Paper text:
We determined the structure of hASCT2, reconstituted into lipid nanodiscs and in the presence of the inhibitor Lc-[name], at 3.4 Å resolution using single-particle cryo-EM. Building Lc-[name] along both of these cryo-EM densities resulted in two binding modes, with the ligand occupying either an “up” or a “down” orientation. While the “ligand-down” orientation resembled the one predicted from docking studies, the “ligand-up” orientation represents an empirically determined binding mode. Here, Lc-[name] is located in a space between HP1 and TM2, thereby occupying an uncharacterized subpocket in the substrate binding site, which we refer to as pocket C. Additional rounds of cryo-EM model refinement were guided by a closer inspection of the cryo-EM density as well as by a detailed comparison of the initial fitted cryo-EM model with the ligand docked homology model and other available SLC1 structures. This led to two distinct rearrangements of S354, C467, and D464 in the binding site, required to accommodate a ligand-up or a ligand-down binding mode. Indeed, the refined cryo-EM structure for the ligand-down ligand binding conformation obtained an improved enrichment score (AUC of 84.6 and logAUC 44.9 compared to AUC 69.5 and logAUC 32.4), supporting the remodeling. In general, ligand-up Lc-[name] is coordinated by binding site residues S353 and D464, while ligand-down Lc-[name] is coordinated by S353, D464, and N471. The cis configuration of Lc-[name] allowed the compound to make key interactions with residues in HP1 (S353) and with residues in TM8 simultaneously, a key feature of [name]-ligand binding, while facilitating hydrophobic interactions in pocket A via the linker region. We identified the ligand-down state as the key pharmacological state that allowed us to explore distinct chemical spaces around Lc-[name] and improve its affinity and selectivity for [name] (e.g., ERA-9 and ERA-11).
The glutamine transporter [name] is an emerging therapeutic target for various cancer types. In this mechanism, the transport domain with bound substrate moves perpendicularly to the membrane, while the static scaffold domain remains in place and constitutes the trimeric subunit interface. Subsequently, the inward-open structure of hASCT2 indicates that the transporter works using a single gate mechanism, in which hairpin loop 2 (HP2) controls access to the substrate binding site on both the intracellular and extracellular sides of the membrane.
Residue numbers in the entry:
A (entry chain B), B (entry chain A), C (entry chain C): 47 to 488
The structure:
Amino acid sequence: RCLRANLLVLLTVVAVVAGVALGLGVSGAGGALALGPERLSAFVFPGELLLRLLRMIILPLVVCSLIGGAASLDPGALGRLGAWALLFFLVTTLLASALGVGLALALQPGAASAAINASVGAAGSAENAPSKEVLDSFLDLARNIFPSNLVSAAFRSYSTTYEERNITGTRVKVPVGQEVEGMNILGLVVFAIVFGVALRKLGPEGELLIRFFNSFNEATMVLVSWIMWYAPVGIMFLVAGKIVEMEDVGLLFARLGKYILCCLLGHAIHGLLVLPLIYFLFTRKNPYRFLWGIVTPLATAFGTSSSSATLPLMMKCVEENNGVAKHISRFILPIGATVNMDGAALFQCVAAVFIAQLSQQSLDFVKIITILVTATASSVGAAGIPAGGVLTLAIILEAVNLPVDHISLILAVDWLVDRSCTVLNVEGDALGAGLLQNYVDR
Amino acid sequence: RCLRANLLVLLTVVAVVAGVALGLGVSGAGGALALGPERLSAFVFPGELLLRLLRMIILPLVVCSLIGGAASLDPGALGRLGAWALLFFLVTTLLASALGVGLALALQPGAASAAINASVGAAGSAENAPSKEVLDSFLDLARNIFPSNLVSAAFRSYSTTYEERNITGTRVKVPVGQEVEGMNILGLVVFAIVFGVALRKLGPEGELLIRFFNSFNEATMVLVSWIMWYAPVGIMFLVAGKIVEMEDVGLLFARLGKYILCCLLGHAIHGLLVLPLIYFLFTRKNPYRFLWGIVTPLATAFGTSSSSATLPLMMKCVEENNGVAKHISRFILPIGATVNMDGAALFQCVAAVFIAQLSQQSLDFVKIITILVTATASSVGAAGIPAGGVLTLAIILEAVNLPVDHISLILAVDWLVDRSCTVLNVEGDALGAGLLQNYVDR
Amino acid sequence: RCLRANLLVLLTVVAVVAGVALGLGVSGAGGALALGPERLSAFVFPGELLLRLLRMIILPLVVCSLIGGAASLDPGALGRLGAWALLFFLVTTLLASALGVGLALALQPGAASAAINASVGAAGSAENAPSKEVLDSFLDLARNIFPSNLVSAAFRSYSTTYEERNITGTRVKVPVGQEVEGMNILGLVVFAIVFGVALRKLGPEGELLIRFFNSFNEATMVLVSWIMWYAPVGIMFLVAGKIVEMEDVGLLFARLGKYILCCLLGHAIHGLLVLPLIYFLFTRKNPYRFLWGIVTPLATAFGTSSSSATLPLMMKCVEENNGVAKHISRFILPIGATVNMDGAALFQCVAAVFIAQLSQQSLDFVKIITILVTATASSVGAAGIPAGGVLTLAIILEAVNLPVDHISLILAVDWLVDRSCTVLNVEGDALGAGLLQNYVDR
Ligand SMILES: O=C(O[C@@H]1CN[C@H](C(=O)O)C1)c1ccc(-c2ccccc2)cc1
Ligand SMILES: O=C(O[C@@H]1CN[C@H](C(=O)O)C1)c1ccc(-c2ccccc2)cc1
Ligand SMILES: O=C(O[C@@H]1CN[C@H](C(=O)O)C1)c1ccc(-c2ccccc2)cc1
């Protein structure tokens, strides 16, 4: 039934296109001048509503899916599957970062152009920042792993601020911990996996609880169906709002065309050559057909710019349309979302290479390897914190000591490239799931 | 067994009467002068303890009751029942507001009297307020519906404050969102209903989870029995404390007797003529007998002045004493508490008409309809936020541009009329439940 | 199998000893000068990680264990068991406080010595404090009992701050309530017990839910096994960090040797004479053998200095190694942790007697009884709040009006005696559990 099957894909693609058209027409016809902030809020509000709906269920779906998936195969096979999955995610993120270096080095987006100016963008506010240390970031990562409280971890994460409690002499900023807002999805993932392993360690005592969590996840999936049918309206209004919130006639594109083209080309090459090649090599099944099977979550990622929001829609589409195993999907795809960020590592590395290319820095071999490794680790470093969309580039440049004086340049255009990043991240998650499904099948 | 059956009703009526007598005697014999703030806190503390007990269980009871009630009848009948229930609540709230107009217009409580003075009450602090816009209130309503996180929604709700982030020129206050304290019971209600519909959409997978939630609610009901047996002491001490906290020899009654009489008469006429007439018309069964069946929750509402607190006691009494169906009770009565506020719409409209009557405003037909509709919507507008006992009148007067210069007059006497409001709200909820029980039975 | 059975006990004792050796060697070899704050954080971080792990599971384990234990015996036997348990905890805490008086009165640690000076310790900051009233502390106790919301009670507790809302004349600080951080484990304990009683009041409706909670607790116990195998590393690094954070060559020991010896001797006499004597008297079974059965939780308490953290390890060890009944363990040991603080009452009383002994106060009989009773009540007074490690001594001295001018003396050495306090608290909990197991068996 092609007409009914492809209806959703048609609807969300039409939603994205019509949202772009609506926003461009509104901005050209007057935009904010004809709109006002109140009508801007009402115009963006369906987007905020879709993101409120899809952030409501990631906690049930992630927790109960991992508990229902971990306790479906014995811990030996689970350990092997988790290890090969982490290896796959690490390799894909690393290949993405290397592709970013190879593109930004060649196209040279940091050539002398309008982007050389940074007074308007920075205006002295770029240097002023928390300036989180790399060690403190890794410690906050390993403290959001193994949370102090599960309930608080359902909406809070640990962030190490810096006070000035060294008045005795030579004032040095010292770390203090204070829980902030944002889900600790990494901690919940680890707790859930460990729980499911515990229930598989038990036998008849755990059958009730596995039945509970599988039923709960199936109910949440039934909610996901209806959220999915709502999603095109939210995507349309969200995209229209996010191109009405800033003019996009071509001024910022004319400013940073090489950098944005480098990022989008890197994302497409990662998402249409590298990972499809890996899938074909391993499972020997049409990767582009599989990619067409998941267009609706990809479009939702492009609209939403959060891997959080698109994941329920994705797990529904992968388990339903494509012939991916239910337990493998449950175990892998949440872990893919919180760890694999191929696009994030990609455009972080490309941004670093761009800001280094302007001012003519060297970056011969050692600094290249450094940016690769710290981008690969920051794939998960940025994962626990939702606020740090591109904030993690500052700590990278602190590690390797580059000019952070114009990091605010990307914040004007962060809303664009992060979308394609989200697309590639969910794509890499699904391709890992398919590969590991075939590996477990063999 | 009349002696054992009516014991609780006798006990709570005696508690209210003895609390009034205790507070009046203490205030006459010296009150605070003989008491001190520390003994005032210890004297009110049983009231605070009862409200802490009854706010502990509304979350379990509401969530699990709606999940156990929604998934007891098919979604078609559920949709019809929900639609006729919302229509009933809307019509009752609208009739209440019209009754408020009809009374305040006739009795004319805003005649020239001591209430004309407002310097002592306002003293310039009335105008200073957040001044929340109507659109922003509706957006916060639809964002507390569809919460971002369920756990946070168990004790937090979304409130749009206003910052001054327009330093570029012509400083205009802009909205920012920041979650505040207070349960998001509307969001939990909607999520729970949707969940129960999902479990009914499933079949054998959901039987476990329905059995879980029904068992959990029955356990919470068993707690409610013991809280109910404690409740008269809390009501007595609470009422005594709330008339010791301000002198009530008759000064404020002598000031606002017409307004308070108008509100209480409106509440009684709504609760003893209109809704009993509707019940008799539809189900043809003794409405005043049914009203006598539920005296203990009504007295608890009068003491507590929160529809939150009285609801567990009410659902216990309605399912136990009166012959109302268990599933219909579960589905309707929580939704009644968070949506139907007949008394709130009533005294909000009466307060508006009173403040308009002083200063001799017109309010011919269009403004009357405006106050009716905005009161009907603010019945649920004030529902998500517990702090806004009468705060929502300011945004109404912002919509229709009346003198808010003396809104602080009612805050001295808000503690009185809100009690009768709570009584009428729970009464309207039960009468809707009985009507819809008979409709489903037919 | 002695070699495999005693492996854990060997490992944690070796961990404590090696942590002491590591910290002393690091402090002697340069300590902070060779370390830096960043490496100090990385060196303490395994300790923080163990405490994050053991605070993650106390909520599941406490809640589900009490629900699974309360609903295993009928409410009559439960009421008797709870009453005899509270009587036992009260008597043991009182005996501990009397032992503290008897030791501090005899050894006279407040003799004229270096400890007479307090300018360096206090420096005027001792008097400045919240100065919480005793009545307000008891009210906050009874409001953390019977929480307003269960979810918030999973990570928040009620603390009455004091504002200055008496500008009308004679500015007097007035209480305001605002929820703060810290688990409301007392409220969760009471709610859980009451819930389990409700499920036992029900019959077939509750069997599912009891099976759920028992399965959930068993899963959490399975997590506890792995946390237990990790624990020695955390204990070693934590102890090393907490003796590297301050020099302990003997300066503070040379300052307060009599006071610390009094506290440790009181703890050992309570833990090795009084309670073993009671156990032998009642159950007639080797108490020191039972004490050897639980060495690993005692060492964990000595390392961690929190009865929160050690309790999962303790309930595992008591149910597994020693022949204590599962239901009795579940019901008693959590209640022991949140109520019985023998060591806390002990060193609080000893600290009071020490600060009274310096400056030559009388403390004949009435003040002795006062300190005993307020210490016995503050055993649970300090229990709800984790921040108040020794903060509760100030409100005691407010009750009985002693010099609080040098309360900051103990804060330098609070990290030492609180460890032995935690050891004795968990020890008293287990001994109560064993006694009541034998009583129920008889
Ligand atoms: O902050 C993030 O990363 C940046 C945000 N936009 C870019 C993108 O989403 O690709 C990169 C982030 C967002 C979402 C989740 C997530 C949460 C719950 C379940 C599953 C996933 C993790 C990390
Ligand atoms: O703020 C409110 O409305 C005013 C407060 N006092 C008046 C009254 O209670 O009638 C009007 C409010 C209070 C309570 C709940 C509620 C919460 C949970 C379950 C069920 C109900 C909704 C809204
Ligand atoms: O603040 C406390 O008491 C002082 C802290 N250090 C000393 C000690 O732990 O002995 C005394 C405290 C700590 C922990 C818990 C606890 C929490 C959850 C489950 C079980 C228990 C109660 C109260």
